[PDB]
Symmetry: D2
Subunit: 325 residues, 4 copies
């Protein structure tokens, strides 16, 4: 596991958020999502029957793994993270365990995680996966239902509309049958997984948390794990905005951000960070040994938004200018 | 129909086609201000552009809700792109399989649903048709008028069909335009208004011909000053043409933002106050206002389009009680 | 005054000071979301920032027109920055020459003109005052609470006066705050509402003291829950505090865009529909809505602020006849 | 006059629009100017009495000639053009002949053209002047009054509100007493004038046009003149949008543009051309030997707008990256 040497010096990665939310793109029956377009289902409490129907329209003719990695590489990014399955519970890979996925439910009929994994392999880009182990709005017993006190980017953390029998919910039925099986799948196919990115535990017991830790280590021996899974059970610390100038034993650090203000594609969110904002931030994080993980929200046709692409390239140009200074 | 049109005051225009899905973006680059021209701007081969049809699945398209919205804003008629410059028919065309019904997963007659929804809602129903430009046909129009600049590149499909001189527009007219014009003027019930583009190549003969087809099939259908000089019922006026028309019928078209087709990046929405003031001014001059919405790939009125249109109606009402 | 405040529903807040002229820009760089903090964000020396006073000449400032506008929107009271964190008084302060009247070409009492304009217009008149932060005074407040982050840098003027421990807030309170509070509570006629900032350093003693000054001078003046616990009349609620107050009087403050001070670059204006819906929701919960405008260097309501506020009023009226 | 060799290779210049219009910044009594904020007086037919009053507020503490030229030079611009006097008739220099000027009428009490001229001299930047020889809204007999047929960025071309006796107007009274005297002043002080930039003649007779030509040649022997003055009477052709791929005998070409859509500062016009748009356009023009003259509309405090500055620098960075390719 030389992953430690490479990660301390990697400096820069691309993150991709993509799913059904990208097609609504922050808009519903004349109204805006919150800041988080990928949260749109919770914001408006969209029934699974309706929300799920987007799968029939998901036909991104312009999705192109080859082209995306070329762009990333040109900007000097050394690794790539992708949404394998977000809060909405729609798998972006061909899951044996669950047919609610890009491959089975959509005209596209293709493995999003796969095509990117290969392209990355060939380009010499490391390949990471993101997975939402706790919230899952598709599963009757999804997590979140005891932590509804805290405010969210939607309404409740859990699917409180389709499944309102709050007391009769049991996350375990969800954990054993979907989360752990799906985690097993993604950690086994698509080759070497360099980085593992989990969502924020609210409900997953330490037992359940420990299980995932163990599962990943045996399946992907060299895979570095983000501090989010569970206390004691990680390799690099994910830093949040206010953690920017808990303990990291390998000396490995990452902060994730987006270029505009949303993680998922949002038509109306044109508040793109300037090239200079992008470059300066990277410089500051890197000098503090913190890696910068920069998100692209793919558009409905599978394209990097024009303004996202432009701004990334200018920050790279600025960087080169400045580093020959 | 004449009395009704003189008092109508307000109409909806709809741009819709394959171009709406690219939404102003092509291989990392921006369309012009006019997003619906996107195929020409970048000279997208017919094979590829047409392929968009395989992705055209607007689950949230809803003629009823759209017309309900239109009516709520006080609009008395609605015009729709039956077929724009791209040569893609948005109705179930017998003569050409390059159409919404046969070529797309959606597999539905957009014009039909709107025609019925309008009939049932008691809204008049108009049609737009590109009788001159046709980027899908080897002998499509446009190739004699290329000195003047466009919102794309050439007027014609000069890329797939570059044999400029061996092109002959007559072959296209005989086989696609007039048949398609015949199609739309017979189905979809009463057609109150007919909207044609600006001839470049269509001879006076051809211009007169289309007129006749409409008169025989749709006697009271009012025709826009674009067909031919002497051979029309209302004059289309542009912004800069307003400070003959034999019936005294007048219309000016605009868009809410700066594009006709949906364009992700064009958020330069005119404020509600701008929209309302213009209509009042036009109406006071008896000019009818036809205001265009370019619906997005899911068939939705863009949020800012809907909000601002509705706010303009509220603004109008306050002032007429004032 | 209590009965009137319970039914008022709608107020204007005004941010104004030297910061408005920089308008979100300093030596090529952006302020935070909160433009009025600009001096702290970049640690602009008092000598330089104060120098803005020499440029403060708002020829188009017009209290009458502003109040006319406010009244037209149905607002029943108006609050103004008498002196914000920057420590610049926007009224003719006897105690400190760092003020609009003496230090600026404009040479006018902004609060006075507004107080009169409001009296004459029949609008109630409120005051905002930064009783705690004061970036102009060597011993200004803020220096005991620097672990928590701000919209600038430090809470206090930690740059001109970096001798953190040899600072003593009491000296500032005695010489500037309470005298200035005394000033504003005696002149400018009837004061209906009083708006203080969040204590960091102001002891309970000092908090109680200001209260007394207001009660003696302005018996019916209603006081915002910021002064001190038990020692107040209405509770200021923030967005996230709403899904004690002994009189049942409540107010929530917001801005139209994302900044309090004028900021050239902050064009993220909330649409009219957003503004109207929020007010209705608050009012239904009896919470009064106080909506802030940061006037620009010429004393003007920004075009998009005026347009959207007025459109929101029209929107409100339509719905209550519906 | 080696100006020919230098200009064919100069490639890039800064233009500055600045005057009273910058303080209204595209806004009047709750309403927007047209696209051209510097036209604001005509758009709303603002009486001279009111419009002129802005002079008392013109106190740009942050005007800084030194800093502006440094920025320009860093972007590789080889010359600088400035508004000496725009359509509004407000002189931005200390005019002996007319007290309606930055020096006499404003607290600033400073010569805008002068301070920039010196800074440019010291930096090794060439120094050009723009002057509106035809429209002058301050003069009772200003030009424009026979050409009111054509649509403008305001209303009429002339001051049609304060001075409506259209038939009793005589441009000559204006030409002899203000235009030619003021042109004499600006072409004599402030040292060598490398470039001369005139507005669009509508009304200035050939006689009057010839006069200006002659006046400049004797006063500034080596000064290159923009094709706008008069047919036969120029050194470089000013190209407009539609003249971009009449006759230029020296082979000298310039196109002027702005970064956003306005020439004068406009608070509300945030439609800044992207860095990439700026760079690509320059490249295209330069390859066709056409010089690119790029406008900055100084803000009320005399500062280059933040987004204007940022975008210029990124285009330069992109250019450097690409030219080492
Ligand atoms: C109140 C609120 O919205 N708080 C948000 C959380 O809702 C949000 O989950 C969290 C981080 O966002 C999570 O991680 C990113 C990477 C993306 O996957 C989101 O969809 C996740 O929800 O940020 C808080 O501020
Ligand atoms: C530069 C440019 O292309 N300018 C365009 C013209 O090309 C265009 O013909 C004209 C009219 O627009 C026509 O009608 C609208 C409704 C839409 O269908 C366009 O695609 C048509 O070309 O508008 C000018 O601005
Ligand atoms: C990160 C940050 O600074 N957040 C700010 C706080 O600093 C601020 O205290 C709080 C309340 O804002 C206060 O009142 C408004 C009206 C204005 O005068 C501000 O300058 C004050 O500080 O708001 C948080 O968002
Ligand atoms: C109809 C219209 O607005 N036409 C405008 C003219 O009004 C305008 O004068 C012209 C060029 O603008 C002139 O030159 C620039 C450099 C600047 O000084 C402007 O203030 C001048 O008016 O462009 C036409 O399109």
């Amino acid at each position: 596991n030389d992953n430690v040497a490479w990660f301390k010096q990697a400096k820069y990665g691309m993150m991709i958020h993509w799913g059904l939310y990208s097609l609504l793109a922050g808009e519903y029956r004349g109204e805006s999502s919150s800041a988080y377009a990928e949260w749109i289902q919770s914001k408006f409490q969209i029934p699974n029957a309706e929300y799920g129907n987007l799968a029939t329209a998901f036909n991104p003719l312009y999705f192109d793994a080859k082209k995306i990695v070329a762009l990333a590489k040109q900007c000097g990014m050394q690794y790539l993270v992708v949404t394998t399955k977000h809060h909405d519970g729609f798998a972006m890979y061909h899951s044996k365990v669950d047919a609610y996925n890009v491959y089975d439910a959509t005209p596209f009929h293709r493995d999003i995680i796969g095509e990117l994994a290969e392209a990355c392999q060939k380009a010499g880009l490391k390949f990471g996966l993101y997975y939402s182990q706790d919230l899952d709005w598709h599963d009757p017993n999804g997590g979140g239902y005891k932590s509804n006190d805290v405010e969210t980017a939607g309404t409740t953390w859990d699917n409180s509309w389709d499944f309102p029998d709050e007391d009769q919910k049991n996350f375990d039925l969800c954990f054993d049958n979907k989360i752990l099986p799906q985690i097993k799948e993604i950690m086994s196919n698509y080759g070497d997984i360099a980085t593992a990115w989990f969502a924020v535990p609210m409900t997953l017991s330490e037992a359940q948390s420990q299980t995932i830790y163990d599962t990943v280590r045996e399946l992907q021996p060299n895979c570095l794990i983000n501090s989010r899974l569970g206390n004691g059970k990680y390799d690099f610390v994910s830093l949040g905005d206010n953690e920017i100038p808990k303990p990291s034993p390998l000396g490995l650090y990452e902060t994730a951000g987006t270029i505009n203000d949303s993680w998922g594609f949002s038509y109306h969110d044109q508040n793109w960070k300037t090239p200079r904002t992008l470059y300066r931030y990277k410089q500051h994080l890197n000098d503090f040994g913190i890696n910068y993980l920069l998100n692209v929200g793919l558009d409905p046709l599978g394209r990097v938004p024009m303004m996202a692409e432009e701004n990334l390239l200018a920050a790279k140009a600025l960087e080169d200018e400045a580093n020959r200074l």
